[model samples]
Target: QGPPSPGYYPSSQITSLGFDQGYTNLWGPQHQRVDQGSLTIWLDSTSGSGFKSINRYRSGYFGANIKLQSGYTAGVITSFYLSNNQDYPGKHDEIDIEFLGTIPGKPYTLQTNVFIEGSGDREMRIHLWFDPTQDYHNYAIYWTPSEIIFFVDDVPIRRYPRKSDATFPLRPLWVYGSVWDASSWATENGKYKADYRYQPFVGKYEDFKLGSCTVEAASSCNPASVSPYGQLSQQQVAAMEWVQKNYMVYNYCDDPTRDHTLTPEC
Candidate 1:
């Protein structure tokens, strides 16, 4: 159980993402592809620069799963780029988690880049060794006005602090996930040919959900503020219930049609 209006991808009501024919591509050129009757392949895009949010200040968590091309070797099929333009011409506040296909055994990996305002010079990158092809694991983020946190299957793994001096991407962010080609620098020690990287890679995504959190303004996030496993407590349930009854005019039901469940279904 988390906050209300939290961001969710494969929502039961909204169906914000699907497996049929809505996925987009980003590499040399932009294009769309079909899921082609597989459990994987649902791509979700942020509505926009998410700066204009419902809550004056808000935070949420989200995740999904992906698979690399069977034999193809080059390029990147990135799942989280934030800029609106395709031409490297526009400034991006991009955050990425791409599975580097060139890695042997495809040791699952994590890559993240931060592009401030419209600048790419101060971008920060991180890579973690793992096996993406093994099973559907949770890759999630916790974003608020103060910082951004990344987690693998509910365990907090990475934390990126908000600049004390103020910086771009400090504002609301548009969440995006997609697979694309990244042949240039997506190789093992830069030892493979470009052609070895261009093959049809397939990614699977499920249990996509979002939630809005009420954050406490402070120096950094209060880890203890949430339960060890990150689920809401009895007090939280009472509060959300109160808000549902009195404030949210749109909410007519006594309970959330979809209760917060981590079983990978809701």
Candidate 2:
């Protein structure tokens, strides 16, 4: 299951960040390469790679520039998001931005998902306006006490507001990035599997920013946090509408099989 609507955005909302602090590799040996501020994850027949943040934040804005692998990259998934299952145990709150690779001619599918507590099925998938493999683009998450907004560059693509504590993700979460073989469901519902001939698939990351309230000291945080917390500007709303109208591929809210009783928001 996924979200009921669609989203899109571009431009950066925060300044670039150096990679000296706040992150560490979670797995993948030398397959995960970090040089100065830029990080790259490579996928081969043997394994894929991942990294995570050293600290968690209760509410904050996190952003990164990403470039995906090109050509015959179907079944590969490059993801960046925030999660807290490792620390909380048996429960997790996550906000995801996942790039699903495709055949040579197909544009990558940018999928967004959110989980509150431990329940998650919400998925929103979009076909981006630009080629993701040709260049790096900024993707971001702005989470506050009231809502969670997903951004592509500076544009606000999707917003998940907090209607109730039970329906929202309120716990602190750590940022994470990874490249993996999602052959089972990533490409056309697994119709296209990753071919080893297309090994060494790569995804690049840079210009990282973590602008938010850290869990250790949430109250005494920087005053200049990510803005427009409660609601979107009229301009942002229009941009969102534009993207949803043209690029949204699947919206779980419109699925007749989905039980609206379980998801009151739908």
User: What's the TM-score of every candidate structure?
Assistant: 0.54, 0.91
Candidate 2 residue lDDT tens string, 104-177: 88889999998877877778889988878889988888887788888886666688888888878878888998
Global lDDT scores for all candidate models: 0.42, 0.81
How much is 192 displaced in model 2, in angstroms?
1.0
Top candidate (lDDT):
2
RMSD of each: 15.5, 4.2
Supply the global lDDT for candidate 2: 0.81
What is residue 47's positional error in candidate 2, in angstroms? 1.2
Model 2 segments more than 4 A misplaced: 1-13, 222-230
